Structures are given as C-alpha cells and as structure tokens.
Amino acid sequence: RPGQGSNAQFQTSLADKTRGLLGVGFLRPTKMASFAATFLLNF
Amino acid sequence: GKIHGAVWRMKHLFATNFKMVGHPRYAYALPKNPLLQ
Amino acid sequence: PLGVKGRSVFAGMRSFIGQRLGRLYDSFYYSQSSTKYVMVFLFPA
Amino acid sequence: SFAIPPANAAALADPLPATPTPPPVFEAVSSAALKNVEEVSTMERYEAAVYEESFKKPIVCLFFARFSLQSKVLLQPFLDFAASASNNATFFLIDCDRVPRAAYHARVENVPSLVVMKGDDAFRQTITDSVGVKTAGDLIQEARSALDQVLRLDQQEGGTKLQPGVSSYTHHIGVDNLNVYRKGWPVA
Amino acid sequence: NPPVWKVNTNEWLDSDQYWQAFVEKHHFYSQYQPGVVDPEAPQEVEAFKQAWHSRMGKFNDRSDTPMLYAYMNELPSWEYYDLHRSAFLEHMTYFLVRTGGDFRFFPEMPPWQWLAHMENLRFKLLSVAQSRRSQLQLANLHGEEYTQKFLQYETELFQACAARLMGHFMFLCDPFIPVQSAEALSAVTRVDNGKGKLFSLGDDVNALFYLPEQQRRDVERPTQAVQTLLGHLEATGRPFNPCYSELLHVHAEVLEERGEHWLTAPGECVSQAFLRRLRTDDPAYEVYCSYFKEMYERFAGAKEVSMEDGRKRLATIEKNAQEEAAAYGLALKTMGSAELAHKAR
Amino acid sequence: ARSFRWMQAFAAVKGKPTAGSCAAGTAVVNPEDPTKVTLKGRYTNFSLQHIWEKYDYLQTHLLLRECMLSQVAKNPRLLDPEINAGLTPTVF
Amino acid sequence: IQHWNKSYEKQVYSESVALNRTFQARNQLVLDRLKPSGAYRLPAVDYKRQLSRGTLVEGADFYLPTAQEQQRLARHFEPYSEQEQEERRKFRFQSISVYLA
Numbered sequence: 125r126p127g128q129g130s131n132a133q134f135q136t137s138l139a140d141k142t143r144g145l146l147g148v149g150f151l152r153p154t155k156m157a158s159f160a161a162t163f164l165l166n167f
Numbered sequence: 168g169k170i171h172g173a174v175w176r177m178k179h180l181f182a183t184n185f186k187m188v189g190h191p192r193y194a195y196a197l198p199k200n201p202l203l204q
Numbered sequence: 205p206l207g208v209k210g211r212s213v214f215a216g217m218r219s220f221i222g223q224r225l226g227r228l229y230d231s232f233y234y235s236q237s238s239t240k241y242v243m244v245f246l247f248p249a
Numbered sequence: 250s251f252a253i254p255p256a257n258a259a260a261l262a263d264p265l266p267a268t269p270t271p272p273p274v275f276e277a278v279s280s281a282a283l284k285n286v287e288e289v290s291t292m293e294r295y296e297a298a299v300y301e302e303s304f305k306k307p308i309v310c311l312f313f314a315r316f317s318l319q320s321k322v323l324l325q326p327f328l329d330f331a332a333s334a335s336n337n338a339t340f341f342l343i344d345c346d347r348v349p350r351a352a353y354h355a356r357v358e359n360v361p362s363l364v365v366m367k368g369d370d371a372f373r374q375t376i377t378d379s380v381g382v383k384t385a386g387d388l389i390q391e392a393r394s395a396l397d398q399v400l401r402l403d404q405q406e407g408g409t410k411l412q413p414g415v416s417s418y419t420h421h422i423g424v425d426n427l428n429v430y431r432k433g434w435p436v437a
Numbered sequence: 438n439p440p441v442w443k444v445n446t447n448e449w450l451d452s453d454q455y456w457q458a459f460v461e462k463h464h465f466y467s468q469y470q471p472g473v474v475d476p477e478a479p480q481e482v483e484a485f486k487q488a489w490h491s492r493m494g495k496f497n498d499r500s501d502t503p504m505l506y507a508y509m510n511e512l513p514s515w516e517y518y519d520l521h522r523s524a525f526l527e528h529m530t531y532f533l534v535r536t537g538g539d540f541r542f543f544p545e546m547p548p549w550q551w552l553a554h555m556e557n558l559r560f561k562l563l564s565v566a567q568s569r570r571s572q573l574q575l576a577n578l579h580g581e582e583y584t585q586k587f588l589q590y591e592t593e594l595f596q597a598c599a600a601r602l603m604g605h606f607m608f609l610c611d612p613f614i615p616v617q618s619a620e621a622l623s624a625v626t627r628v629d630n631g632k633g634k635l636f637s638l639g640d641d642v643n644a645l646f647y648l649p650e651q652q653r654r655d656v657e658r659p660t661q662a663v664q665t666l667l668g669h670l671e672a673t674g675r676p677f678n679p680c681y682s683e684l685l686h687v688h689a690e691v692l693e694e695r696g697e698h699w700l701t702a703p704g705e706c707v708s709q710a711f712l713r714r715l716r717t718d719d720p721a722y723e724v725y726c727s728y729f730k731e732m733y734e735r736f737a738g739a740k741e742v743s744m745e746d747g748r749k750r751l752a753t754i755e756k757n758a759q760e761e762a763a764a765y766g767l768a769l770k771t772m773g774s775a776e777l778a779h780k781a782r
Numbered sequence: 783a784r785s786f787r788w789m790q791a792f793a794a795v796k797g798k799p800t801a802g803s804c805a806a807g808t809a810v811v812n813p814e815d816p817t818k819v820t821l822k823g824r825y826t827n828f829s830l831q832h833i834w835e836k837y838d839y840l841q842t843h844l845l846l847r848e849c850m851l852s853q854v855a856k857n858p859r860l861l862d863p864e865i866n867a868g869l870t871p872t873v874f
Numbered sequence: 875i876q877h878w879n880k881s882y883e884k885q886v887y888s889e890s891v892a893l894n895r896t897f898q899a900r901n902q903l904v905l906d907r908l909k910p911s912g913a914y915r916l917p918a919v920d921y922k923r924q925l926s927r928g929t930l931v932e933g934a935d936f937y938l939p940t941a942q943e944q945q946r947l948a949r950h951f952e953p954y955s956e957q958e959q960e961e962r963r964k965f966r967f968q969s970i971s972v973y974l975a
Contacts, residue, residue, distance in 0.1 A: 126696030127382035130554045136899040140892075144899030152510070155238045159508055160246075169472035170464045171446070176474040177456055178449050182441050189455055189950050192437075192477055195814045196948040211409045223414060226914030233910055238510040250494045253831060253925050256808045256823060259718040260801035264824045268712040269730040272737040275706040278612060279655045292821075314825075316539060316714045321702045345825040349807060353919070353927065358827050359542055375912065380548045381535055381694065415917045423918025426931035427809055430819045433944045435462075435934040437477045451966060458946040458953040467936035482933065489932045493921060515922065518830055525833055533844055540834055540841060541806060541826040549901040556894045563887065567880065575876050585836070592843040594869055599846060600792055602853075602860065604785030609849055614856045621859050628856070643785075659848070662855035669858040670865075670872075678871045692848065700852060707852050711845065718802070719842055720795035728788065761785055762863040768786050769867075772793045780869050807928030821928060829926045 264346035265315065285331040286340040295343070295351040296431075299369050302339050307367040307399050309334075309392060310341040312357045319378070320361040323385040327363075330389050338396055353425045363388055365395040371411035372399040514545045522581060531555055534691040537714055554694075558687045565683050590776045597773060601765065603728045605643045606735060611707040612654035613646040613736070618755045619748045622647070626744075629653050637742040637750070638735060643758055645747045646739070656701060659689040708732070803835040 136144070181187050188197070232240060282288070289295050289310075302308060311327050313320035331340035345352040345360060355364045356375065363376040374395040376388055403411050420428045429436060441449070450457060463470045463477075470476050499506045499516065509516075518525040528547055532538065535551065602608035607615040613636070616622045622645075626633075629649040636646045648654075657665075663685045670676055677685070692699055701710045708729055715725060742750075769777050807823030828834070853860060864870055924930035938944045946953040954962060 125382065126384070127380060127550070127694060129690070129694055130550055131382065133557055134550065134553060134898050134902065136895055140895045141899040141903060143896045144901075144903055147900060147904075148896065149893055150897070150900060151237060155510055156242050159238050159510070160242050162508065170460070173464065173472040173474065174450055174456075174460060175446050177459070178441060178444075178446055180474045181456060182449060182453070190459065190477065190947055193948045193950070196950060208409065208412065210407050211412070215409075216412075219412065219414075223914060226910075230910045230914050230916070233908070236508070236511045239508055250491075251498060251922065251925075252490075253829075253922075254804040256806075256928065257799050257801060257804045259799060260804055260806050260823050261808065262717070264717060266717060268715075268726055269733055271706060271709065271733050274736070275612070275708065275733075276704060277651055277654070278704065278706060279652055280701075280703040280705075314539075314542075316537065318537060318698055318700075318702055318710075318713075321705075322698055349823070349825040349927070350821050352825050353929065356915070358544060359536075359538075373913070379544060380550055381696075382550075384696075419917050421917075425919075425929050426924060427819050427821065427929060429931055429934065430811060430817050433817055433941055434937045435944075436931055437482060437933055447966060451963070454953050454959065455947070455950070457962075462936075462938070462947070466938060469935065486932045515829065518833065522833065525830065526837065529834075529837070530840065530844070533841055540802060540838075541824065541828045543828050543830075545827070549898065549905075553894055553898050556890070560887065560891065567883065571876075571880060588837070588840065588843070592839045592846075594864070595843060595846040595850065596792055597789060598850065598861070598864060600786065600788035601863065603788040607860065609853070611852070611856070615860070616857070618859070621857060624859075625857055656852055657855035659851050659855075662851045666854050666858045666861075673862075675865055675872050675874055678873060681871055688847065689851075692851075700848060707849065711849055714845055716800075716841055718800040720798040720800075721792060721842070724788070724791045724795065727791075762866065765786075765863055766867050768783075768789070769869075771786070772789055777869065781867055805926045805928050809928055809931075823928055826926055827923065829920075829922045831926065 265344070283328050283331070285335045286328060286342050288342045289348060289351065292348055292350045295341075295348060295354070298339070298341060299354070299366065303366045303369050307338045307365060307372065307396065307403070308341060309338050309396065310343055310351075310355065310364045310366065312343045312345055312352055312355065312360060312362040312364065314345050314360045317360050319385070323361050323388060326385050326389050330392065334393070334396060337400060350425060350427070354421055356424070361388075363392045363395075365392065365399055367399050367403065368411050368413050370414040370416045372402065374399070526584065527555060531691065534688065535694050537695070539716065554691075558690070561687065562680070562683055565679055569679055586776070590774075590780075593774050593777055597769065597777065606638070606732050607644055608728065608732075609708045609711055610646060610732070610736075611656070613648060615644040615646055616747075616751065617644045617758045619751045622744075622747065622751060635742055635744060635747055636736075636739045637747065638739050642735075643754055643761065645742065645751060645754065646736075656707065659692040659699065660686075663689045800838055802838040803831055805831075 232244065289298070298308060309331070311320075311323070313324070327340075334340075343351050345357070355362075355366075355373075357364065357377070359377050359379055361377070365372065365374040365376075367373075376391045376395065378388065399411075420432055422428050422432075438444075450460070471481070473481070475481065495502075496504050497506075499519075512520070518528075528551075529540070529543060531551055531554075532543060532547070533540075599608050605615075614625045614628075616625060616635075622635075625647050632653075633647060633649040636648065667677065667682065667685075676682075701707060705713075712725070712729060715722060766781050769781050773781075801824060805823075806826035806828075807821050810820050810822060812818040812820075850861075861870075865872055919927075919929075921930055
C-alpha cells in the first residue's frame with residue numbers, strides 16, 4: 125500500500141493514548157487562564 | 168441635501184453636452200453610427 | 205419560485221436548524237482551544 | 250498591507266501545451282469521449298450541467314490534472330464505473346487548469362477528486378486522498394457508496410428532502426466573486 | 438430652451454428619464470454614495486478599491502496596531518508559514534515528494550501522519566548529525582542562508598549533470614541503458630542475464646545503448662536504487678558523507694511512500710513521465726522538449742549492434758569520454774556558477 | 783563544447799519569470815455583455831508566493847533527483863565524472 | 875560542557891518524541907472520530923486566496939435585485955415603462971400633508 129510504510133510507525137502505548145485522550149500538551153489550561161485574564165484586563 | 172447637490176451638478180454637467188446621451192459605461196448598448204467606418 | 209410542493213415549512217425549518225447547528229459545530233471544531241472552551245462554557249455558565 | 254501582482258505571461262499562457270510523442274519502442278515496457286462520460290472544456294458547459302442536469306439527475310465529476318499519476322491510474326476504473334452507472338447518473342471529466350472556476354466551485358484542493366453532486370448543494374460529497382493511503386479502487390468504492398446514498402435520499406420522501414442549501418442565497422459569491430456578473434449585480 | 442441654471446432642478450429631472458435611473462441607482466439603492474456628479478467614474482472606482490484594500494489590510498494584518506490579531510496561540514496556515522520559514526520549506530518538500538504535485542496545490546494544513554513522519558525523519562537526521570559532531574567536531578579541540586546556498590548549488594549541479602547527459606543522449610533513456618565502458622556493459626548485461634540487444638549511433642553519440650527484455654524492462658524501487666549507487670561507490674572507494682547518505686535514504690523513503698506506481702504509469706516511459714510532471718511555466722520546458730524530440734527521432738532510426746562489436750568500440754568511447762570528463766572541469770568555469778567553479782577548484 | 787550545447791541552452795534561460803511569483807489568473811469581462819466573464823490562467827490553492835518565489839526551483843530539482851535515481855538504478859556510473867571533478871561531497 | 879549541552883539536546887528531543895507520540899494518539903483517537911464531514915463548511919474563500927486566483931471583486935456596496943432595474947442604464951430608450959413613469963410621477967415631492975397626519 126502507499127502509506128503503510130508511514131502508518132506502521134504510528135503505534136502507541138497505553139499511557140501514550142491515555143495522555144492523548146486527556147490532552148496534556150494540547151489543552152493548556154494555563155493558556156486558557158492567561159487568555160481569560162488578558163480579556164478581562166482589556167475592559 | 169447630498170442628493171440635491173448631486174442632481175444640481177448632474178444638471179449643469181450633463182444636460183448641455185451633446186456627448187452624453189447616457190453614461191459612457193453603457194455605450195456598448197447604443198446603436199451604431201452609420202457615419203463611422 | 206418560492207416553496208416546493210409536497211414539502212412543509214416545518215420541514216424547511218428543520219432543514220435550516222440542522223444547517224445552523226452543523227455550521228456551529230464546524231466553527232467550534234475549527235477554533236482555538238485556548239479561547240473557545242472558556243468563551244463558550246465557563247463565562248456563559 | 251498585502252498585495253499580489255496581477256499576472257504574468259507565463260501564468261496566462263496555455264496551461265496544457267503539447268509535448269513530443271515517442272515512437273512505438275518506448276511504449277514497449279514490462280507493464281504494458283469513451284461513449285459513457287463527458288469531457289468538460291468550458292465553464293458555460295459546467296454551469297449548464299450543475300444548474301440543470303444536476304437538478305434533474307445526479308452527476309459524478311472527476312477533477313484531475315496532467316502532472317498527477319494518481320489521476321492516470323484512476324481514469325480507467327472511473328471510466329468503468331461510468332459505463333456501469335451512467336443510467337442513474339451523468340459523468341463528467343474536468344481538468345483543473347483548463348477549467349479552474351469549476352474547481353473553485355466544487356471546493357477541490359487536491360487532485361484526483363471525485364465529486365458527487367445533486368441539486369448543486371442538496372447532495373455534495375467530495376472523495377479524495379489528502380494523506381496518500383487510499384487507492385483507486387477505494388476511491389471508486391466510496392464513489393459508488395455516495396451515489397447509492399444520494400439516489401436513496403432522492404427516492405426518500407416523494408422526491409423531496411433534496412433541496413439546495415446555502416447556494417439558494419449565496420450564489421457561490423464568497424467562493425468565486427465572479428458570480429456577481431452572472432447575477433447581474435453592479436461592480437462599480 | 439431656457440438657461441439651464443434658470444431652469445428648476447426638479448423640472449429638469451422630471452423631464453429626464455435616464456438620469457433619474459442614475460440617481461436611483463446611487464441615491465435610492467444606496468445610502469453612502471458620495472454626492473458627486475459621477476460616482477461610476479474611474480477615479481471613484483479606484484478610490485473605492487484602494488479604500489477596500491487598505492481597510493481589509495488594517496483589519497486583518499499582523500501589525501503594530503492590530504485589530505483582529507489578538508489572543509493568538511494556535512495560528513492559521515498563512516501566518517504560521519509566514520513566521521516559521523523553516524517549516525514552510527520542510528512541509529513543502531515533503532508534499533512534493535510524498536505526492537508528486539505542484540506548489541499551487543499545497544494543502545492549507547498538512548496531515549498529522551505527514552507531520553509525525555517528518556518528526557521521525559528529523560530524529561534520524563539529528564541523531565546521525567549529532568553523533569558525528571560529538572565524535573569528530575570536538576576531538577579537534579543563520580540556517581536560512583545556508584539552506585538557500587545548499588539547495589541552489591544542488592539544483593545547479595543536477596542541471597549541469599542533466600545537460601552533460603543530454604549532450605550524448607544519455608539523460609532520460611529508458612528502457613534503454615547507456616554504456617561508456619565494457620565494465621558497465623557487463624554490469625548492465627547481468628541485469629537481463631545476457632539477453633536483450635545493443636544499439637549504436639555513429640560517433641556523435643559517445644555511448645552505446647542496451648535494451649533488456651520486455652519482462653525485465655521495469656523500473657526499480659528508489660531504495661534499491663540508492664543501495665545500488667552507494668554499494669558501487671564504496672566498491673570504487675568513494676563513499677558519500679553520512680549526512681548526505683541519510684538525505685538520500687530519507688528521499689528514497691518518502692518516494693517509497695508513494696506506493697506501487699511511484700514514478701510511472703503502466704504503459705508509460707520515464708521520458709513521458711518527466712514531460713508529464715514537468716512544470717509548464719519552467720524556462721527549460723522548450724529545452725527539454727527539444728531534447729526529447731531529437732532523442733525520439735534519433736532512437737527511431739538507431740542501428741542495432743551486437744555485443745562484441747561494441748567492446749572494441751567501448752574502449753575508444755571510454756577514452757574520449759574520460760577526455761570529455763577532463764574537459765568538463767574547465768567547461769564549468771565557462772558558464773557554471775561561482776559555486777561550481779570554486780568547488781571544481 | 784557541443785556536449786555542453788545543453789549547458790549553454792540552460793544558461794540562456796536563467797531569470798525568466800514564472801507563475802510562482804504572481805497570481806495564477808485574471809478575470810476579463812466581455813464589454814458588450816458585462817454579465818459574461820472569463821478567467822484566464824491556471825488553478826491555484828496557494829497564496830504564499832512571497833515565500834515560494836525563492837524556492838520555485840525545488841519542484842524541478844526534485845524531479846531531476848527522482849530521474850537521476852531512476853537512471854542510476856540501471857547504471858550508477860553516470861555520476862563518476864562529477865565525483866572525479868570533486869563537485870559532490872565525497873571522502874576519497 | 876559539551877557533554878552536558880549534548881545530553882540536554884538529547885532529552886529535549888526525547889520529550890519531543892513523547893509529545894509526538896501523544897499527538898498521534900490524540901489525533902487518531904479523538905480528532906479523526908470527531909472531524910466534521912464538510913457539508914456545513916464555510917461557504918466562502920479568503921480574500922488572499924481569491925486575490926491569488928484572480929477572482930476577487932471589491933465593488934458594489936449596493937445591488938439591483940431585478941433585471942428590469944439592472945438594465946435601465948443600458949436600455950437608453952425605456953429606462954421606465956409608461957405605467958412605471960406615471961407611477962413615479964406621483965412622488966415628485968414629499969407629502970407634508972401625510973407627514974402632518
């Protein structure tokens with residue numbers, strides 16, 4: 125297949141997929157708080 | 168008042184030209200001159 | 205040609221609401237994670 | 250401040266020039282109209298299709314480009330699908346560089362692309378491989394599934410349930426602003 | 438008529454039915470048009486266009502006075518690639534190789550699969566480069582410009598090689614295989630196991646071509662190609678540098694990602710594939726068309742020549758070919774760039 | 783010299799402009815029928831011309847690489863002239 | 875120093891590997907399942923892409939809905955029908971009587 129060579133490299137751990145489900149480095153509640161703070165300060 | 172001024176200028180600048188039978192952007196729709204060739 | 209035969213204005217309303225909700229889902233999906241969750245859930249709540 | 254220069258002689262030149270053809274020895278390799286489709290050459294024809302034929306019975310459009318090898322691989326099975334299912338739908342063959350306004354209309358970003366259309370927005374399904382994992386048979390299977398789906402949905406509820414959507418009032422003006430001329434609106 | 442400045446304005450407009458439509462168009466159907474005699478004139482139109490463009494730029498652009506650029510943590514495609522020029526190049530080279538395509542079809546956002554593969558290749562390259570540096574750079578004791586120079590020199594090099602081969606019609610000849618020596622003759626005859634034919638052109642073509650059998654007229658995978666090249670180079674005793682070898686290997690990998698048909702269609706030849714994928718805006722388009730026309734019309738009438746007739750010919754071909762290769766170094770000073778010249782010196 | 787005919791041919795066409803530095807299309811309205819409008823040019827989903835104008839060569843460069851690879855899979859001895867000339871990075 | 879900065883880079887990219895693995899997992903679990911179809915996509919194209927396509931139009935803050943109203947300045951001979959003319963003749967002035975009432 126065309127993309128099987130690349131899609132064979134994509135095999136994850138249980139902890140990897142739990143961390144992705146939770147979105148550790150992709151939700152960023154500190155960034156959300158910074159946005160809220162800046163938005164309220166902009167009043 | 169804006170409309171009044173616009174029409175008051177249109178009068179002076181269009182009504183005595185002999186060159187503006189309509190607007191120049193629509194001259195394609197006019198009939199053709201028999202004198203031009 | 206306004207309206208079509210065999211179709212109801214309520215069916216058209218359902219169509220429109222479906223369109224609006226799908227568009228809202230698309231716009232929420234294609235948005236910043238930093239801002240959208242806050243502005244859509246935590247300030248409204 | 251953002252600007253793009255208007256165009257160049259290269260850009261406005263013929264996108265599809267002829268190239269030399271080999272003798273019948275290079276063709277000898279280890280790996281060695283159509284009466285069922287319609288090659289589209291003109292946005293007039295494309296609009297006629299989309300606004301009348303796609304309202305009568307569905308259409309399936311293959312958007313390709315010459316540089317792509319996936320298009321060359323997908324052409325023949327697409328022609329077989331057309332020969333199979335031309336009774337239920339119409340089949341069109343579009344080159345993006347020859348008719349770009351048709352590609353902007355269908356919202357195609359990669360080639361090759363299948364597009365199933367009915368009512369110009371009542372059913373629009375785009376099938377493609379942006380990643381590079383699928384194959385031609387997969388694409389044709391997806392196209393068959395989409396055609397079955399749209400046919401079923403047209404049969405559903407006495408012919409209704411397939412009405413145009415945002416094109417009822419947009420006229421594809423945000424996608425391609427040149428439709429204001431078609432609608433006869435001013436541009437001054 | 439009376440004097441028009443004596444005439445009442447509303448009476449003139451009641452008399453005139455055409456400029457009525459002109460006023461309705463601009464003053465009944467709109468509320469913001471200027472009160473000038475000619476709102477449709479080119480000055481007004483162009484002023485409106487420039488105001489439009491300035492407004493949209495001031496609103497959307499990233500500036501010192503930003504209206505809409507605010508609360509930015511996840512950037513869109515355009516702004517991302519405008520700020521990170523390193524990633525536009527990497528994301529663009531991957532797109533052209535993983536999918537043989539034009540820059541005009543560059544996707545707005547790449548797939549996560551492509552991004553992950555890119556990160557894996559980055560692992561490979563950074564691993565090799567870092568470990569090489571660790572060993573050699575320490576026992577001793579602006580990346581944009583460097584990348585531009587590297588890519589410019591490389592494309593210049595490949596252009597020069599293509600011109601050199603087109604000089605003797607060896608540039609893109611398949612299923613033919615060119616030969617300039619009996620060693621290469623034996624090497625490429627081992628492909629078809631002695632089967633096939635050999636063809637010649639008289640003393641303007643400084644090489645002899647070999648046709649394998651139709652079952653063995655296939656193209657090889659790019660990883661196999663790279664392995665063959667490198668093995669030949671180490672057998673001759675001229676190995677590439679490890680960074681360049683890794684570059685070749687990753688290029689072969691992303692070409693393998695294309696799948697079964699990675700370069701050619703079933704009934705297609707490599708010259709036809711090149712002319713197909715060749716950019717039509719390219720300056721060398723007519724040059725390549727010239728070359729392939731001449732090559733086709735020559736190979737149509739090329740004569741057949743059996744095996745032993747060539748080897749005695751291949752000796753003198755080897756001689757004059759090494760003489761031409763010696764001349765090539767001086768010929769690069771003729772028209773090649775300063776990079777090629779200084780690297781030849 | 784006549785072998786470098788093609789080098790001369792390439793060096794002839796060096797700085798000719800392309801579609802990668804400009805917009806790929808332009809609209810023209812029929813003056814007799816302003817409702818009718820034609821788009822002269824190509825397709826494009828690309829707007830980073832102010833960057834791509836510098837790397838415009840990469841497409842044909844990578845094409846040349848893929849073709850040199852195809853030729854070398856059959857005969858790897860075509861590059862030996864450049865190796866002997868010392869243009870490539872090699873460790874003799 | 876060399877040792878330490880080299881190993882620093884080493885586990886920098888270790889953390890990068892971890893990030894990439896969790897990125898892949900996040901995508902292929904959540905986002906490929908939650909991706910929108912594309913039926914309800916945005917019905918427009920950005921002005922920069924239109925400008926590169928040669929497609930953008932800037933003008934006509936106003937419009938003319940009906941073709942009768944569009945072709946007025948091109949007809950040159952009947953900008954208004956006779957019935958329309960007599961109907962327009964009723965509004966040469968504003969009605970102060972109606973305003974007052």
